[PDB]
Amino acid sequence: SSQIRQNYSTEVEAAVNRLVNLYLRASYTYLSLGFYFDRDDVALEGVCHFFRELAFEKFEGAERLLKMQNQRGGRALFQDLQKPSQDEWGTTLDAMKAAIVLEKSLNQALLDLHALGSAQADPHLCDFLESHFLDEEVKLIKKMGDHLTNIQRLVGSQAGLGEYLFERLTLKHD
Amino acid sequence: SSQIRQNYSTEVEAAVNRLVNLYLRASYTYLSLGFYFDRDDVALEGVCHFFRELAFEKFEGAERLLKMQNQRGGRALFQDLQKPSQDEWGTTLDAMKAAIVLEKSLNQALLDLHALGSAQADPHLCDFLESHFLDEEVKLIKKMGDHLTNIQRLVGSQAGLGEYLFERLTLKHD
Amino acid sequence: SSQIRQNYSTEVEAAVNRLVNLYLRASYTYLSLGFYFDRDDVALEGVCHFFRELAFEKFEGAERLLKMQNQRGGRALFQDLQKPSQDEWGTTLDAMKAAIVLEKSLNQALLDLHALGSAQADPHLCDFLESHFLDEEVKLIKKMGDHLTNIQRLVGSQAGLGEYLFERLTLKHD
Amino acid sequence: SSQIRQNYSTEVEAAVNRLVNLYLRASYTYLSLGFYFDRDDVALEGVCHFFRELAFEKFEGAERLLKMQNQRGGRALFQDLQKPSQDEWGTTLDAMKAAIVLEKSLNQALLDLHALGSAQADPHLCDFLESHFLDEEVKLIKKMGDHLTNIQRLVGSQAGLGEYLFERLTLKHD
Amino acid sequence: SSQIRQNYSTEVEAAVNRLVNLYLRASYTYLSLGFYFDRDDVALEGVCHFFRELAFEKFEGAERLLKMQNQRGGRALFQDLQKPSQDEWGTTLDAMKAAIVLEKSLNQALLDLHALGSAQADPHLCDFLESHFLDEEVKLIKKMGDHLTNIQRLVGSQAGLGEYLFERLTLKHD
Amino acid sequence: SSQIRQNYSTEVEAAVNRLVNLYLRASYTYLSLGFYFDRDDVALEGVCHFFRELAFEKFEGAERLLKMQNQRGGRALFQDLQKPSQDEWGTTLDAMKAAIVLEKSLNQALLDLHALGSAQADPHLCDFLESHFLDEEVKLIKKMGDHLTNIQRLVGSQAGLGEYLFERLTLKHD
Ligand SMILES: [Cl-]
Ligand SMILES: [Cl-]
Ligand SMILES: [Cl-]
Ligand SMILES: [Cl-]
Ligand SMILES: [Cl-]
Numbered sequence A, B, C, D, E, F: 001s002s003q004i005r006q007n008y009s010t011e012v013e014a015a016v017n018r019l020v021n022l023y024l025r026a027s028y029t030y031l032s033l034g035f036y037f038d039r040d041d042v043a044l045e046g047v048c049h050f051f052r053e054l055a056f057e058k059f060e061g062a063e064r065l066l067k068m069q070n071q072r073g074g075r076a077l078f079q080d081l082q083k084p085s086q087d088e089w090g091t092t093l094d095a096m097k098a099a100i101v102l103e104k105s106l107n108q109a110l111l112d113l114h115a116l117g118s119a120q121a122d123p124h125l126c127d128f129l130e131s132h133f134l135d136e137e138v139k140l141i142k143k144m145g146d147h148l149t150n151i152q153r154l155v156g157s158q159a160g161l162g163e164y165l166f167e168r169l170t171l172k173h174d
């Protein structure tokens, strides 16, 4: 069949395609989050920029998976990409909570694929995830948790003031 | 009559002169807004600077219209310039609300002139407005709406604190 | 309702959201085309690079439309993104034919939206499309037609040789 | 028929070819004007240079139209180019009057083609003319009218002195 | 009342507002003069540039007065700005005569305000006018008188030739 | 009659005007050849560029002849410029064959004019042609013959492949 394929299971090939779908879904979710915060009636530039940057980061993860699929001799298969779970994302707090939920779901999918690779004795796959995905996800989730704690401490009894200050003094703007 | 005039209606010529009056009136309004915020009993430098910059921008729009009037062979006609609608402009919120009202009025005058040009089959006029006025106005109104949303979120129950923070962390000063 | 919206119809707002979907669908189609040509059993780097660049270009078009939607006071609404029409794209000729069909479809959607804007007397919309989309599309379709003619002249009776030479001597690589 | 042609009428295609003929005729007229002023018995270098520069400018307009014809999928068709209307061009005043008449005729042809494009719902054509021809023509006609006024004010009762001074102090020489 | 106001009479405050009106009226007069000389049927670039520069200079004088009003604790009050005294300004000579009349009127208003300040024992006001207005006005009136003498010497029996030569060899152009 | 004319026959003056017509006709032929090869259904950039460069070169020859006519005291006389002999130019081979035929015709006209100058004892004319035209034409015809031989050797039994390779590997592009 394939001239280069070696030690690459059909199970891993399919899970890789599924993970591409998840990362592209996540990228699309972040595009929607970013543009919501650019609305004139939301207007939080640093929050917009944060999520637009994450849309690109998730796309780059999908791109790396597609490069790897071909390096291994599998075949990329694309599926429909479902729209994000919400049209309007509420407050910065609500948005950051949704993002952490999204990231935990990508992380579990990475861990599930790592376990499949381990079970199939596919060390290239396992190394690929360890080298380019697992620590990146851990670092991002830590950042998001740090942000959640700071957003929550700023709510107090003046939510608008806190949401403005977080965007201006923590998030980068521009 | 004119050695260069071609496809330039008397209706457009007159509307151009009227629009110069509107832009100069707007420039004068912004001069008054700017100096109000420089009062020792208002003292919001970033707000002053914002409006003084807009006084210059509106003047430059009037200047471009006057250059174009001559390029087309029409004759600039100047009228009395009415004073701004207020002597004192209230809070930054009140001022930004007045500015958005002013900008919507200039925008409608641009759109009305574009429609006249379209009706008169004057594509140079229509292009001129599209290339140097329509998008500039859209961008400015979006900026002003973003500012309004941020000012409103900062009012809460501590209006002075919010007005200070907006001027310091959003408006340019320095 | 909206503090900035002016001369922006619900019909244009909805068509803009539909056009974002079309551009993102096109971007996804080009991602699939690009990775197909990176397969070890296809291996045409310049063709891969051509289509991956177009995936980014179509994404940037969607991004510009989303920025504009917000500048005008409309609300971005995202829908499901359908998968590309094919999983395997055949020869470079077949792929370039599919791309020209795709581009003609985006072009017609641009022209349809321009006509709606003209009918609604929305010159900002019309200018936006003229300034950032119509000529870009015309230039791209011309390029693709030039490529089709060169690919076709190279088929003769030695198709593989011609497909290699086109990728090496016309398309940028590496 | 054509693999790239879309929304491009036969009427516009033919009018574009006609406009190429007009621009090349105008270029040839300016070549003749330029060399007349280089005659030893006329010897007005700045006037020669002015018209030779315009010969190139009109050629570049024809070249842009030909590029566009191909970008749109139309076919350039060339016709005989008629010689200029005069062999000898009189005074600088006579020449500048002939040039303004020529430019008004090109301008009307641009406006006529714009109107045809508008009628045919061809916004690429209309934008192309607005972006690269309408304002260039308006600016040139204004310049020529400014020159005519200065030449006329210099005639008085010493025509030769005035013609020399205009060439030396207004026209560029080197 | 005011937290900073000291030794600043209501009479000076009001006269300062009146002088702002005069300077803005003068600025508007110079804008009209400048654009008249940019007409295709007048076409004297150096004269246009001279008056457009003076429009800016008079605006800057108004701006300095407004800054000072606030520095002293007075309140800027803006009034309607009357249109210039003429729609068409005749020859360069006629225009320069009107400008010298205008400048003498601003100068007398400066001297009147200086005398009021002296009478009110307001040395800051008097110094402000001496340091930023009195000598600037004297220098400008001298320049304008030098220009008038040169324009008059050039009229002789060839007015157009003289008006051209003055614009080309004295006034700055490009 | 002429203050500078010396040793310049009416026969040479007229032949110079005729040669200007021939060079401009040739320039127009090359403009048509160039744009034919820019058609989306021909698409040979290096061939387009080759002929567009020759259109400019032939124009420059006409310009040099016109400069010389005036240097000698003759009078440039322009005639109608006939359209090129074909609307469509076939293959690169067909086009290069037509160009060599065109160049041989210009060369014979140069040689005929040189012989007239020799007969009229006009050494300035003869030197002018020797210094700026005869060797330029010989070099160009040699280049074109070298191109013809290479195009012919590439036809074999795969004409499209050969036409592509010639354009990519010999003609400058990209
Ligand atoms: Cl499906
Ligand atoms: Cl009045
Ligand atoms: Cl759904
Ligand atoms: Cl014919
Ligand atoms: Cl009033």
Ligand SMILES: [Cl-]
Residues within 6 Å of the ligand: D083, F080
């Ligand atoms: Cl004839």
